[PDB]
Amino acid sequence: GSLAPKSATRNPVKLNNFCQIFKKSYEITKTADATKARTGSALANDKKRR
Amino acid sequence: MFDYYRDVEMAFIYGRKSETVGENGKPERTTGGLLNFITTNRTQFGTGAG
């Protein structure tokens, strides 16, 4: 015929992460843009690689 | 609720049988677990002695 027991409790855990900035660029001279090449447009080829 | 269920299960597996007088002067009892009754067929597998 005893009394009710005491109570107890607990809490969760927390986790974190950050955001990151990514940058990639390409450049070409205006003279080279006008020149014709057998392989193809130099500006278009560079963007694929980048 | 999870704690209550886990306690009931573990008591029914590993409990021991006893009777004693409580603080208020009333009987206090504990139930004997499954391992308490199984005594003939026990085996400890391992490399060490015993």
Give the DSSP H or E segment for B18. strand B18-21
Closest A-chain CA to B23? A2
Instruction: Give the count of beta carbons closer than 10 Å to the beta carbon of residue A46.
Output: 12
Method: cryo-EM
Alpha-carbon span B33 to B29, nearest angstrom: 13
Q: Which residue is it, tokens 């026990």?
A: B42
Alpha-carbon span A41 to A50, nearest angstrom: 15
Please count the residue pairs, one from chain A and one from chain B, whose beta carbons lie less than 8 angstroms apart. 6
Burial bucket for residue A3 (CB in 10 Å: 0-12, 13-18, 19+)? exposed
Contact B44, B23 (CB under 8 A): no
Alpha-carbon span A46 to B16, nearest angstrom: 77
Token pair recorded at residue B7: 């306690």
> Which chain A residues are within 8 Å of B24, Cβ to Cβ?
1-2
Alpha-carbon span A31 to A34, nearest angstrom: 6
β-strand partners of B21: B27
Q: Nominal resolution in Å?
A: 2.8
